[PDB]
Amino acid sequence: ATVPDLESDSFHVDWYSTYAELRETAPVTPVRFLGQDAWLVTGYDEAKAALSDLRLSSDPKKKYPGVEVEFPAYLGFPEDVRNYFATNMGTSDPPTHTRLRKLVSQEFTVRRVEAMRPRVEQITAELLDEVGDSGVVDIVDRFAHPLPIKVICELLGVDEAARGAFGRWSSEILVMDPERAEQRGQAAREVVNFILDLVERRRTEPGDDLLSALISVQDDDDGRLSADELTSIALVLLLAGFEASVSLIGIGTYLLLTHPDQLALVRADPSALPNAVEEILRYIAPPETTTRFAAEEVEIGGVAIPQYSTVLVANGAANRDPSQFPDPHRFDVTRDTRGHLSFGQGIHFCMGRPLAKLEGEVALRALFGRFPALSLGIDADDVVWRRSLLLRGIDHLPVRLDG
Ligand code: HEM
Ligand SMILES: C[C@]12CCC(=O)C=C1CC[C@@H]1[C@@H]2CC[C@]2(C)C(=O)CC[C@@H]12
Ligand SMILES: C[C@]12CCC(=O)C=C1CC[C@@H]1[C@@H]2CC[C@]2(C)C(=O)CC[C@@H]12
Numbered sequence: 001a002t003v004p005d006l007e008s009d010s011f012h013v014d015w016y017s018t019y020a021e022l023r024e025t026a027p028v029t030p031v032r033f034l035g036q037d038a039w040l041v042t043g044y045d046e047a048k049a050a051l052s053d054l055r056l057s058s059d060p061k062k063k064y065p066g067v068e069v070e071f072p073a074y075l076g077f078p079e080d081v082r083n084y085f086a087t088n089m090g091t092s093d094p095p096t097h098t099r100l101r102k103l104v105s106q107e108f109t110v111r112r113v114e115a116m117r118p119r120v121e122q123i124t125a126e127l128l129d130e131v132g133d134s135g136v137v138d139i140v141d142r143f144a145h146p147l148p149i150k151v152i153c154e155l156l157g158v159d160e161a162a163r164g165a166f167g168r169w170s171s172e173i174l175v176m177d178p179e180r181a182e183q184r185g186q187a188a189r190e191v192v193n194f195i196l197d198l199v200e201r202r203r204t205e206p207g208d209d210l211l212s213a214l215i216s217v218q219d220d221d222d223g224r225l226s227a228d229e230l231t232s233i234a235l236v237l238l239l240a241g242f243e244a245s246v247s248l249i250g251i252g253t254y255l256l257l258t259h260p261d262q263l264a265l266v267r268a269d270p271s272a273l274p275n276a277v278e279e280i281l282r283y284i285a286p287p288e289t290t291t292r293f294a295a296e297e298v299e300i301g302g303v304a305i306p307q308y309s310t311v312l313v314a315n316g317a318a319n320r321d322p323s324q325f326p327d328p329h330r331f332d333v334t335r336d337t338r339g340h341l342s343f344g345q346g347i348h349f350c351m352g353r354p355l356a357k358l359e360g361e362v363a364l365r366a367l368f369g370r371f372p373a374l375s376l377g378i379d380a381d382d383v384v385w386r387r388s389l390l391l392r393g394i395d396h397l398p399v400r401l402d403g
Contacts (some may be wrong), residue, residue: 044319045324048341054093101347210237254380267372288314377400
């Protein structure tokens, strides 16, 4: 009786209360979203199990007898555009996933990330030098946002008259509003056109960047990446490379400001920063929801999910499951955050974890170390949270530098 509609304000206003209600009733339940029926998984155990079950595919390009596969993330995307966004690690199942991840991991390494620490510190310092030292500034527009973008552009060899453009496109693709569908499909074409030009430019003039590296990358047993895989991989690395990092820095600043106790704990011991980052991700996971497609009938938590169903694994809800995390609504930077699902679970585990932790640690440490009297420019209850189950974040965060 009464299936929940994920488009309602209950999933965007104090949404975590709605998750607890649902999980209590049934960790696995049928819902409606973007006009289609789906199953949402709010339980921790149920979420881990689902992400570990390979009968739940991550490939939207797959064709099934009399079935039209529709992953919500692709609302309004023309098919040619869809395939450019969907021919990479996160959009492939083994054995394709296996080789794509192997070829990329040869170049996208911890060594390459570590060598970037000096540059990310410098960029952080510059951005902070620019905000001044007094008044109210949107910490997102002046810090949280440009920091991750500069780092990903340098890593991929993207430049000046390009950056900032994909910011607005990214902004449109982040939300699925049925009425803005084609405007969504349009920004998507632009992102693609940009990438196509970027890769060809790099083929013509290779450098020390990661993208040049991926173009030459080769393996004896796996081979090389096709033009399409290369273009799709560059697209996801660019997009996923900065968007969630923005959410981490913005939500994190917001969190520490509203929990003075935890902020004091951090300023005191810098060695407590790393776990603070983990607790911020656990508390409000940017990728609140992850999508899977049931290639076969699958039983999740005693519930049979019919074949060909769309499954929304709510990573965000699972992180606040009381049986896994006691007092899940208490933001505690000292708690064991082991096992949260914010970077995924299983084969599709986040390849970008090292870079994300680097940015969050360096950013927040630099932010709060520089502004000891930093405070929220607005009332905590007035902070506008982005309406997206795909990726949570704060688009505007006014803070007072001097207090
Ligand atoms: C705040 C940090 C981030 C969070 C919360 C995050 C979260 C995730 C999650 C939840 C997944 C799994 C998605 C699924 O199972 O369908 C994932 C996958 C992935 N992430 Fe991250 N991520 C972050 C930053 C990054 C960065 C900086 C990059 C690097 C360019 C990146 C690259 C990827 C890629 C390529 C995958 C696909 C992995 C695969 O399919 O094999 N991520 N990430
Ligand atoms: C989790 C994630 C990473 C960081 C970020 O900022 C936003 C997202 C949401 C979309 C995810 C992406 C990871 C790569 C994924 C799985 C694909 O291959 C298609 C969907 C896409
Ligand atoms: C999460 C994300 C990151 C950067 C950004 O600016 C906006 C978005 C939302 C659309 C995501 C994209 C990551 C790549 C995704 C998952 C695809 O492969 C299709 C939909 C698309």
